[PDB]
Amino acid sequence: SDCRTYGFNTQIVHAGQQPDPSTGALSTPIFQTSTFVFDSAEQGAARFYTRLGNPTTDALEKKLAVLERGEAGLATASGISAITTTLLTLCQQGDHIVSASAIYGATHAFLSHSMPKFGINVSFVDAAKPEEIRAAMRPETKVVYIETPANPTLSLVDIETVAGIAHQQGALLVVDNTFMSPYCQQPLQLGADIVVHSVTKYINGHGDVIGGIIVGKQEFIDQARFVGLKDITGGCMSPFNAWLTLRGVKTLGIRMERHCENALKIARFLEGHPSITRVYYPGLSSHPQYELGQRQMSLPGGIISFEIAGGLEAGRRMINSVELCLLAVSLGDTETLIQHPASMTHSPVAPEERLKAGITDGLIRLSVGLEDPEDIINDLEHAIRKAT
Amino acid sequence: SDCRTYGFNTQIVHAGQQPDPSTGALSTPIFQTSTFVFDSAEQGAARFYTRLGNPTTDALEKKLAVLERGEAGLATASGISAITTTLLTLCQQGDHIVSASAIYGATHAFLSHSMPKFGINVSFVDAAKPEEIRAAMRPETKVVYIETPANPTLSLVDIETVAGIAHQQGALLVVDNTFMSPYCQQPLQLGADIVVHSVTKYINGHGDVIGGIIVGKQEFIDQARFVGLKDITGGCMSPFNAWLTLRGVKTLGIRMERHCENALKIARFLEGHPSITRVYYPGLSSHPQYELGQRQMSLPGGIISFEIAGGLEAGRRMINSVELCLLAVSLGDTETLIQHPASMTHSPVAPEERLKAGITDGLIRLSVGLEDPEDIINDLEHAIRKAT
Amino acid sequence: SDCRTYGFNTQIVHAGQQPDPSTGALSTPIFQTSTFVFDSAEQGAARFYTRLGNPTTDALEKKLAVLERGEAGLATASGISAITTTLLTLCQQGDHIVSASAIYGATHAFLSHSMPKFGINVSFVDAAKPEEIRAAMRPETKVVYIETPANPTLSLVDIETVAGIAHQQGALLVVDNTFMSPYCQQPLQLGADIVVHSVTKYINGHGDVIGGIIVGKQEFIDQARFVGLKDITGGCMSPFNAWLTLRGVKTLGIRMERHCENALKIARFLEGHPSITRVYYPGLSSHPQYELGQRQMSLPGGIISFEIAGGLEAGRRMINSVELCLLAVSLGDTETLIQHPASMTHSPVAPEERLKAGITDGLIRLSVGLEDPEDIINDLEHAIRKAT
Amino acid sequence: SDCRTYGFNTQIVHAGQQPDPSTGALSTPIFQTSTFVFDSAEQGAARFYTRLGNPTTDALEKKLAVLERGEAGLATASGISAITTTLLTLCQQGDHIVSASAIYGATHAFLSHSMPKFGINVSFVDAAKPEEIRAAMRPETKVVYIETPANPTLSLVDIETVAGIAHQQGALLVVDNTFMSPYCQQPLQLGADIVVHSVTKYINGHGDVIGGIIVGKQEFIDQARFVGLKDITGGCMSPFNAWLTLRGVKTLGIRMERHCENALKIARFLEGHPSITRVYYPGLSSHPQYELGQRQMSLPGGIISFEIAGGLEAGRRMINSVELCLLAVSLGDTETLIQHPASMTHSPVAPEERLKAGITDGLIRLSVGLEDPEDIINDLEHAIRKAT
Ligand SMILES: [Cl-]
Ligand SMILES: [Cl-]
Ligand SMILES: [Cl-]
Ligand SMILES: [Cl-]
Ligand SMILES: [K+]
Ligand SMILES: [K+]
Ligand SMILES: [K+]
Ligand SMILES: [K+]
Ligand code: NA
Ligand code: NA
Ligand code: NA
Ligand code: NA
Ligand code: NA
Ligand code: NA
Ligand code: NA
Ligand code: NA
Ligand code: NA
Ligand code: NA
Ligand code: NA
Ligand code: NA
Ligand code: NA
Ligand code: NA
Ligand code: NA
Ligand code: NA
Ligand code: NA
Ligand code: NA
Ligand code: NA
Ligand code: NA
Full 3-state SS string of chain C: CCHHHCCHHHHHHHCCCCCCCCCCECCCCECCCCCECECCHHHHHHHCCCCCCCHHHHHHHHHHHHHHCCCEEEEECCHHHHHHHHHHHHCCCCCEEEEECCCCHHHHHHHHHHHHHCCCEEEEECCCCHHHHHHHCCCCEEEEEEECCECCCCECCCHHHHHHHHHHCCCEEEEECCCCCCCCCCHHHHCCCEEEEECCCCCCCCCCCCCEEEEECHHHHHHHHHHHHHHHHCCCCCHHHHHHHHHHHCCHHHHHHHHHHHHHHHHHHHHCCCCEEEEECCCCCCCCCHHHHHHHCCCCCCEEEEEECCHHHHHHHHHCCCCCCEECCCCCCCCCEEECHHHHCCCCCCHHHHHHCCCCCCEEEEECCCCCHHHHHHHHHHHHHHHC
Catalytic residue among A58, A104, A225, A365: A104
Cβ distance D68 to D188 under 8 Å?
yes
Task: Give the other-Cβ count within 10 Å of A203's Cβ.
Answer: 29
Rounded CA separation B21/B25 (Å): 8
Cβ distance B361 to B354 under 8 Å?
yes
Neighbors of chain D by Cβ distance (3+ pairs < 8 Å): A, B, C
Q: Judged by CB atoms within 8 Å, which residues 340-379 of B form the interface with D?
A: 369-372, 374-375
| Maximum alpha-carbon separation in chain A | 75
H or E element, residue B301: none
Rounded CA separation D243/C158 (Å): 44
H or E element, residue B91: none
The Cα-based distances of A201 to A365, C187, C245 in angstroms read 15, 36, 20
Chain A hits for B326, Cβ within 8 Å: 37
Ligand 18 centroid distance, CA of A318 (Å) = 66
Catalytic residue among C95, C158, C176, C379: C176
Task: Give the other-Cβ count within 10 Å of D323's Cβ.
Answer: 11
Cβ distance D307 to D278 under 8 Å?
yes
Question: Count of CB contacts below 8 A, C vs D?
Answer: 224
Beta strands in D161-270 (DSSP E): 172-176, 194-198, 212-216
Q: Residue D51 catalytic?
A: yes
Strands A172-176 and A141-147: parallel
The Cα-based distances of B300 to A242, B67, B126, B293 in angstroms read 38, 18, 21, 7
- The helix, strand and coil proportions of chain B, stated in percent and rounded to the nearest 5, come to 45, 15, 40
Cβ distance B171 to B98 under 8 Å?
yes
SS (H, E, C) chain A: CCHHHCCHHHHHHHCCCCCCCCCCECCCCECCCCCECECCHHHHHHHCCCCCCCHHHHHHHHHHHHHHCCCEEEEECCHHHHHHHHHHHHCCCCCEEEEECCCCHHHHHHHHHHHHHCCCEEEEECCCCHHHHHHHCCCCEEEEEEECCECCCCECCCHHHHHHHHHHCCCEEEEECCCCCCCCCCHHHHCCCEEEEECCCCCCCCCCCCCEEEEECHHHHHHHHHHHHHHHHCCCCCHHHHHHHHHHHCCHHHHHHHHHHHHHHHHHHHHCCCCEEEEECCCCCCCCCHHHHHHHCCCCCCEEEEEECCHHHHHHHHHCCCCCCEECCCCCCCCCEEECHHHHCCCCCCHHHHHHCCCCCCEEEEECCCCCHHHHHHHHHHHHHHHC
Ligand closest to A387 (CA) is 12
Rounded CA separation D167/D186 (Å): 18
The Cα-based distances of A93 to A115, A117, A140, A141 in angstroms read 9, 9, 10, 12
Rounded CA separation B73/B188 (Å): 13
Selecting from A254, A326, A372 the residue whose C-beta is nearest the C-beta of C26 gives A326
C-alpha dihedral, B114 to B115 to B121 to B122, nearest 10°: -80
The Cα-based distances of B162 to B14, B137, B150, B215, B291 in angstroms read 33, 12, 15, 19, 17
Ligand 2 centroid distance, CA of B318 (Å) = 23
Chain C hits for B31, Cβ within 8 Å: 20, 23, 25, 27, 29
The residues, ordered by sequence, that sit 6+ positions from C248 with a Cβ below 8 Å of its Cβ are C199, C203, C204, C205, C206, C209
Catalytic residue among A58, A95, A158, A176: A176
Rounded CA separation C145/C155 (Å): 15
Query: D378: exposed, middle or buried (C-beta count within 10 Å: 0-12, 13-18, 19+)?
Result: middle
At how many degrees (to 10) do helices C55-68 and C239-249 cross?
40
D235 to C233: CB separation less than 8 angstroms, yes or no: yes
Q: Does A56 touch chain B (CB under 8 A)?
A: no
Task: Give the other-Cβ count within 10 Å of B369's Cβ.
Answer: 30
D109 to C230: CB separation less than 8 angstroms, yes or no: yes
Per the entry, the structure determination technique was X-ray
C83 to D234: CB separation less than 8 angstroms, yes or no: yes
Ligand 27 centroid distance, CA of D292 (Å) = 28
The Cα-based distances of A320 to A313, B35, B42, B83, D370 in angstroms read 10, 19, 9, 43, 48
**Beta-bridge partners for B98:** B123, B144
Cβ distance B256 to B299 under 8 Å?
yes
Chain C hits for A206, Cβ within 8 Å: 27, 247, 250
Cβ distance A311 to A365 under 8 Å?
no
Q: Judged by CB atoms within 8 Å, which residues 313-342 of D form the interface with B?
A: 323-324, 326, 328, 330, 333-335
Chain A hits for D24, Cβ within 8 Å: 36-39, 49
Q: Residue A134 catalytic?
A: no
Rounded CA separation D10/B107 (Å): 34
Kindly provide the resolution of this structure in angstroms, with one decimal.
1.5
* Domains (range + CATH), chain B: 6-252 (3.40.640.10), 253-385 (3.90.1150.10)
Angle CA A127–A123–B231, to nearest 5: 95
Q: Does D13 touch chain A (CB under 8 A)?
A: no
**Beta-bridge partners for A30:** D30
DSSP B39-55: SSHHHHHHH---SSS-H
DSSP D291-309: HHHHHH-SS--SEEEEEET
H or E element, residue B327: strand B326-327
Backbone angles phi, psi at D186, to 5 degrees: -130, 85
Question: Residue length, chain D?
Answer: 388
Strands A96-100 and A121-125: parallel
Angle CA A284–A286–A292, to nearest 5: 80
Beta strands in B51-179 (DSSP E): 72-76, 96-100, 121-125, 141-147, 172-176
Strands A276-280 and A303-308: antiparallel
Backbone angles phi, psi at A137, to 5 degrees: -75, 145
Three-state secondary structure call for residue B308? strand
The residues, ordered by sequence, that sit 6+ positions from D172 with a Cβ below 8 Å of its Cβ are D90, D142, D143, D144, D166, D193, D194
Q: Does C152 touch chain A (CB under 8 A)?
A: no
Rounded CA separation A99/A144 (Å): 6
At how many degrees (to 10) do helices B252-271 and D252-271 cross?
110
Rounded CA separation A248/A199 (Å): 10
Three-state secondary structure call for residue B21? coil
Chain C hits for D32, Cβ within 8 Å: 208-209, 244
**Beta-bridge partners for C99:** C124, C145
**Beta-bridge partners for A138:** none
Task: Give the other-Cβ count within 10 Å of B323's Cβ.
Answer: 11
Chain A hits for D34, Cβ within 8 Å: 26-27
Chain centroid to Cα D146, Å, comes to 11
* C298: nearest Cα among C184, C150, C202: C184
Q: Does B52 touch chain A (CB under 8 A)?
A: no
Ligand 2 centroid distance, CA of B253 (Å) = 14
* D115: nearest Cα among C121, C230, C236, C232: C232
Rounded CA separation A122/A84 (Å): 14
Three-state secondary structure call for residue B260? helix
H or E element, residue B276: strand B276-280
Backbone angles phi, psi at D310, to 5 degrees: 100, 10
Question: Count of CB contacts below 8 A, A vs D?
Answer: 77
Q: Judged by CB atoms within 8 Å, which residues 290-309 of D form the interface with C?
A: none
> What is the Cα gyration radius of chain C?
21
Three-state secondary structure call for residue B385? helix
The residues, ordered by sequence, that sit 6+ positions from D110 with a Cβ below 8 Å of its Cβ are C231, C232, D80, D83, D84, D87
The Cα-based distances of A295 to A68, A148, A183 in angstroms read 17, 13, 14
**Beta-bridge partners for D25:** A36
